[PDB]
Each structure stands twice: as structure tokens, then as C-alpha cells.
């Protein structure tokens, strides 16, 4: 019976909530109460990357922490040398409505996607000297929001059809379709070991998926609105979610519940991007108020503020060595902060 | 200089890339962008045919003006997560079928099709991203509407309607109902044109509307707002 099934589901939810409450002997606030505050963080704009003529929607650092890719609505994917402000490549996309970009860990490939529901993967190292589209992965029935490279052959995408997918590029097929979200999935983050990945969707839920097996292991709730940004903790045992409720949240995988909410009364605008430094101490979140706020991860106190973007900060990334922080906003500029 | 030979050559390559980007940006700015929306079967495909997966792209050229029509009817996702990508388009072509005053939606009979069109129009016209963005309102299927009003009256769609059941007066009433959904009648302006299957002046109407929009935009840009 449908009523019996709903009652069983409600009972299981009650049991899960009871277990989570039982495991909550203390909180991250009191445990880190005696830790020294980080202090006033002031980051200066070392570089400003000019050349984009439309709103920047995506950005991804390379592994070497020098080359970064940027996607904006003018239909171009620009690869920048951050050390000396230069344009290595300018790939003209077929669809100008790009909402995500990815840099492969090796550096041989760059993926883009958007309202075409197609993950287009381009080859940077080619004997012809020009960037050529290696593959056009299709099969998603909704807009692509984020794509992350596992390696040079597998890519993980999230779409607006409430699904995520794992593609092998050499056949362009969906190896594993991750389903279970009710709303559109807007962000995904790969764990450092690249065995689990967390996807945040518009039903205010973040789900943790096993890549090899293919089912959702844990579901984290608590947000009052859509999750637009997700980012794994460097340890891989936590992650951070940004939402339109003007709050960030830190979820622990092993504790299977939230640990802290970063919020302030002066902030009403939603979070577009969320990233960590290479220590897990600083949570950098891009906000719609043309600002990028740096929180202390262990103490909810606001460590610092980055201003200098004239429009909404859409994308935000941190290099693998943690040297610099790239921020790209809707004012068609990328700023490298240090 | 403190620059190597290959560093200098890389700088030259970056300068060439910058020049190409500027050229393509000028070409793109010379274009006109239209976002084409419609309440499902609203005659949108018919007009798409007469001017010439996810987002459908259409390019045509009329009187030395290069248009770019974007159709997002196949997205079937949360519109609020990608409607901001079209902020700054030159115009929004909204297609409404006048034959839907009788037909009710397949999903439940309590909620009417022209009411769906009106709700979509309210969402798009009053959207925070489209405040100064003009709307070109196409009212399609006028022949079927004119034929059908004789049998069933307009009172079903509008109970408060009190007027003659002639084609002209009912069409004017529907147009007025659609233009009173515009909360801001000063920042934005609504162009209404009636079309059918055999109409051949729709592209001309769109051209006139976009020319007027361009005139307004460059009046704002020239300091004569």
C-alpha cells in the first residue's frame, strides 16, 4: 500500500534523525572555542585578466597552478597564464551559453558545457597546433552545471535533469547514471582520492556518491534553499555547501550531519561559489553582492573580505599549492588575489 | 626588457588573440539577440519556420540586420537557474496561441491554457532580469480563434468579460489583458502583432520593433534618455 510505504519512509527518516542526534555529543563550535583566531586577512589583486567581453560563468585552475581556464558568455574559452597575464588559447565554442568549464589534471584536455546539454571536451595538445574538440558527450536532457575530470578518460557531469553522469570519453557513453535528486543539480566536487563525489542540488540536498558502485551513500539536508556551490574539504571527510539562503554549511561525511553554518545578518544575497584553501582553514565563498567573503572554517567568524568586482562573483577557485585565489565575476574580469 | 625570446613571442601571440577577441566582440555587438518563449503549443514553431536537445539557435539576416533567435522551450528545467543568462538580450519574442481560450491543459482541467500563458507572461515580463527588455508579443492562430469564437464565447476564459463576441473586440480584449500584466509600463514597452499560418509580414514587424528598441537604447547611450 502507498500509505504503508510512506509510513515506512517516515519511520526510516525518524530513525536516521534520531541516530544523528545521538551522535551529536558536542559541536564544532565548542571544540574549537579555544583555538586562536586566524586574524584579519587582506588579499591584494596581484593580476587582473582582461579579454572577456561577457559574463564569466566558469573557471578552473590547472594542476600546475599556473594555467587556468575561463568560460564566459561571449562564446569563448580562454586559457590564461596567471604568472604573466597572457592568453595561451582562445577556443571558440559552438554554443555561447556555457555554464561550466574543467581543466584535466594532466592538462591535455579542457571540458565545457551549458544549455546545449552537451559536454564538449577539447584537446589542447595537438599536432595541428590548434585546439580541437575531442568529444561531444550527449545524453543529458537538461543543462549542464558542472563537469569534473577524474582522469583523461572519465569525466563526471551534473545536469538540470536531476541527474549526474560518468562518461568514458573514448566511447562517449554514460557508464553510470547517478539518480536520486529531486531538483536540478548545480554543483559537484570530487574527493582527493577520486572515489566519492558530492553533488548539491536545488532540493536543498547534497548527496554523496560512490563513483565505482553508483548509488547515493549519504544525503545531507539543512539548507532552506537551492545549493549552488559545493566543495570538498582537503581531507576528504567533509564538504562545504553554498546556497541562496545567504549561508554556507559544513557537512561531515563520517558524522553524517552538519557541523557549522557560516552566516551574517548583513548578508542576504546567495552564494554562487565555494572553495577551500590548501589547509582547510579558510572557506572562500563568492556572493551576489559583488563580494567574496573568506570565513574561518573552524570558527564561524569572518576572516576577511575581497572586493573589486563590479558585478556578481560567479566563479571562484584556489590553486593546488594554495598560492593564489582566482575570482571571476559577471563584469567580464578575472582577479588573482594573494 | 627582462623578457626571453620565447616569452616575447608568447606576448605577441597573446596580442594576436586579443585582436581576434576584439574583432569577434565587435561582430557580436553588431548583432541583435531575441529570446523566443511560448506556452508550449503556442505557434512558436510556425514563426520559427517563417523567419527562416536543449537551446535551439536560429540566425537570419533582414535589411542588413543579423538576428539571433534562442529557443528554450525544450529545457524543461528550473527556469530561474538559467533565465539570467539571457539578461541583456535585445528583445523577447513571446508567442501566445489565441485558440487556447477554450482548450484546457492535459494536466488537470482546473487550470486553463491561456491562464498558463498569462502566468508565464507575468513571470517573464516582471522578472528582475528583464526590466528594460522589450517584449514583442505574437498572438498566433488568429484564423482558428476567429472561427471558434462563434461556437464557444470568450466568457469561459474571462468570466468578467462583458462585450460583443466579435473577432476584433475579443482580440483587443485579450491583447489588453496581456498588456495589463506589465507592472512597469515606463521602463519597458510591449509590441503586439496578430499572426496566422499565411502571414508574410511577421519579419517586418520584428524588424520595426528591434529598430525601435535600438533607437531607444542608443538614445539612452547618447544622453537623451
Amino acid at each position: 500500500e502507498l500509505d504503508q510505504l510512506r509510513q515506512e519512509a517516515e519511520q526510516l527518516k525518524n530513525q536516521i534523525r534520531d541516530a544523528r542526534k545521538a551522535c551529536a555529543d558536542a559541536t564544532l563550535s565548542q571544540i574549537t572555542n579555544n583555538i586562536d583566531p586566524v586574524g584579519r586577512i587582506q588579499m591584494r589583486t596581484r593580476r587582473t585578466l582582461r579579454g572577456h567581453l561577457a559574463k564569466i560563468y566558469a573557471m578552473h585552475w590547472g594542476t600546475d597552478s599556473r594555467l587556468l581556464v575561463s568560460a564566459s558568455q561571449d562564446g569563448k574559452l580562454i586559457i590564461w597564464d596567471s604568472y604573466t597575464t597572457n592568453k595561451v588559447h582562445a577556443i571558440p565554442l559552438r554554443s555561447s551559453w556555457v555554464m561550466t568549464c574543467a581543466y584535466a589534471p594532466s592538462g591535455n584536455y579542457v571540458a565545457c558545457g551549458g544549455l546545449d546539454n552537451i559536454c564538449s571536451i577539447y584537446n589542447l595538445k595537438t599536432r595541428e597546433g590548434n585546439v580541437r574538440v575531442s568529444r561531444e558527450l550527449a545524453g543529458h536532457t537538461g543543462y549542464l552545471s558542472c563537469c569534473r575530470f577524474l582522469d583523461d578518460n572519465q569525466i563526471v557531469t551534473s545536469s538540470g535533469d536531476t541527474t549526474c553522469a560518468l562518461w568514458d570519453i573514448e566511447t562517449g557513453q554514460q557508464t553510470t547514471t547517478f539518480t536520486g535528486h529531486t531538483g536540478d543539480v548545480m554543483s559537484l566536487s570530487l574527493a582527493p582520492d577520486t572515489r566519492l563525489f558530492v553533488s548539491g542540488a536545488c532540493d536543498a540536498s547534497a548527496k554523496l556518491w560512490d563513483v565505482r558502485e553508483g548509488m547515493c551513500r549519504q544525503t545531507f539536508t539543512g539548507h532552506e534553499s537551492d545549493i549552488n556551490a559545493i566543495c570538498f574539504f582537503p581531507n576528504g571527510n567533509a564538504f562545504a555547501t553554498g546556497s541562496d539562503d545567504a549561508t554556507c554549511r559544513l557537512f561531515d561525511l563520517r558524522a553524517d550531519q552538519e557541523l557549522m553554518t557560516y552566516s551574517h545578518d548583513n548578508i542576504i544575497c546567495g552564494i554562487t561559489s565555494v572553495s577551500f584553501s590548501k589547509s582547510g582553514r579558510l572557506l572562500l565563498a563568492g556572493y551576489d553582492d559583488f563580494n567574496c567573503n573568506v570565513w574561518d572554517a573552524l570558527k564561524a567568524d569572518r576572516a576577511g573580505v575581497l572586493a573589486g568586482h563590479d558585478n556578481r562573483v560567479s566563479c571562484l577557485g584556489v590553486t593546488d599549492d594554495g598560492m593564489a585565489v582566482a575570482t571571476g565575476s559577471w563584469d567580464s574580469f578575472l582577479k588573482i588575489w594573494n | 626588457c627582462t623578457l626571453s625570446a620565447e616569452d616575447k613571442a608568447a606576448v605577441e601571440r597573446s596580442k594576436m588573440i586579443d585582436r581576434n577577441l576584439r574583432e569577434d566582440g565587435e561582430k557580436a555587438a553588431r548583432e541583435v539577440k531575441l529570446l523566443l518563449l511560448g506556452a508550449g503549443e503556442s505557434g512558436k514553431n510556425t514563426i520559427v519556420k517563417q523567419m527562416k536537445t536543449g537551446i535551439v539557435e536560429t540566425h537570419f539576416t533582414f535589411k542588413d540586420l543579423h538576428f539571433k533567435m534562442f529557443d528554450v522551450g525544450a529545457q524543461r528545467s528550473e527556469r530561474k537557474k538559467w533565465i539570467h543568462c539571457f539578461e541583456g538580450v535585445t528583445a523577447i519574442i513571446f508567442c501566445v496561441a489565441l485558440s487556447d481560450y477554450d482548450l484546457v491543459l492535459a494536466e488537470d482541467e482546473e487550470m486553463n491554457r491561456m491562464h498558463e500563458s498569462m502566468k508565464l507572461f507575468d513571470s517573464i515580463c516582471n522578472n528582475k532580469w528583464f526590466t528594460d527588455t522589450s517584449i514583442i508579443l505574437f498572438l498566433n492562430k488568429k484564423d482558428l480563434f476567429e472561427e471558434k469564437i462563434k461556437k464557444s464565447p470568450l466568457t469561459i476564459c474571462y468570466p468578467e468579460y462583458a462585450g460583443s463576441n466579435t473577432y476584433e473586440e475579443a482580440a483587443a480584449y485579450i491583447q489588453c489583458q496581456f498588456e495589463d500584466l506589465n507592472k512597469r509600463k515606463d521602463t519597458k514597452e510591449i509590441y503586439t502583432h496578430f499572426t496566422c499560418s499565411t502571414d508574410t509580414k511577421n519579419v517586418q514587424f520584428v524588424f520595426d520593433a528591434v529598430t525601435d528598441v535600438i533607437i531607444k537604447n542608443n538614445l539612452k547611450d547618447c544622453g537623451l534618455f
Epitope: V88, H89, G107, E128, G129 | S4, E6, A10, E12
Partner: single-chain antibody, 232 residues
Framework: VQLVESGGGLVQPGGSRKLSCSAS????????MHWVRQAPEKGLEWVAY????????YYADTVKGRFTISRDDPKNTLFLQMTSLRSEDTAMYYC??????????????WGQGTTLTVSSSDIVMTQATSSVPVTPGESVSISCRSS???????????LYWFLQRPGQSPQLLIY???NLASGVPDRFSGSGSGTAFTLTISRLEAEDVGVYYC?????????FGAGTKLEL
Amino acid sequence: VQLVESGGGLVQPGGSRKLSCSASGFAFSSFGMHWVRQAPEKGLEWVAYISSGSGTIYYADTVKGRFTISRDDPKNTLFLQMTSLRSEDTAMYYCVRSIYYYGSSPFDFWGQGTTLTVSSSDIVMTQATSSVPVTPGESVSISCRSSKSLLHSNGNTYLYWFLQRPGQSPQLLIYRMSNLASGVPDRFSGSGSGTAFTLTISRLEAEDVGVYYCMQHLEYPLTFGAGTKLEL
């Protein structure tokens, strides 16, 4: 990728010729181009260079004024118009492509060249080895010394190793003194200390026999070494 070149022949001194380099299989416009001479029994010497989009043109000191190098991007071709020819220009000319960005590999593909005969402050790169014996399966080291430090302040040492097989166009091996080119087996390695550099082959076969050259790329008189020949 092909870089076939045309022209050459026997020219009386004081004349003029046009050397043509036809390119197919790659983007011409994004690639800078170089001309490199080869005397009948001697090493390689850089002649002329044009950047992408014909922005910058460089010539060697010994060929300044007389030669003029140009490109036709729509036709995908390279021209070298040569005037006031003397017996010092009798060489096997080589058309070389070179792209320049971060992490790029300049001097990838060398054309087959054209034979041309005439009727009768730069960095010094020296390889004193000249000729060293080789046995298959062994490991060999080839040394190249520089007049000034090839290490630029940015951290990129600018040294290129080329292998010219008997009766073959030169082939890039190492770019920037430690980076292996595409299609080159991993047995090749490069090391250096700013001025003196070595290139090591772990296990050679008959395919590795040839003459090895070292090029600098710091300033732009591009100078090669004397070369070191391997004989089994």
C-alpha cells in the same frame, strides 16, 4: 604534417632566387617559421624567422639586408627571396615550424629541405666531442657548453637538442633542456647547470645513430653547436 620545400639548384654568384616552403596538415597562421641552412659537410646555422601574423622578422647577421623572408597565410606557404648570392650560401635549406606559448615545444617539424649551390656578441655553443664511438645497448652522454648562462631569470633554460639521422631531416629531441618531445622514446634525457648541459641515451639502437646538435634560444642570433656524430 608535411613541410615540403621547393626551389634550389645551381645559381651563378650575384643572382637571386626564391625558396618556397609548402605546409600542409597543420595551422600555418598560429605557427612561426624559421629557415635553417646546412652546408654540404657542416653544421646548422639560423638564417631568418617570422612570427605568427608576420609581426616580427629576424635575420642572421651574415644574411642581413640581402635576404627577405615572408609568408602567405591564405596560401599556406613560406617564401625566402635571396639576393646577392655568394659561395657561402651553398646549403641544404630547411623549413622549420615553431609555436610559442607556455609549455609549447618550438622547432617541432623540420622540412626535407632544398639543395642550393652557387658556382665559384652572439652566444658560442661548443661541443668538443665531435665524434664518439657507440655500441648498441650501452648508455652515452653528449655535452654542450655555452658562452653565457642559458638560464633566464624566469627559470626556463633555453636549450634544444636535435638529432639528424644520416640522410634525414633534423628531429627535435629535448626542448628547454629537460623536456621530451612528442614521439621520442623515454630513454633520452636532458640535464644542465645553466652553462654546460648533457644529453643521455640509456640504451641505443641503430635508430639512434646520427649527429646531435644543441641550440640556444635566449637571444635571437640562434646559434647551433658543432654537432656530435655517433658511429656504431
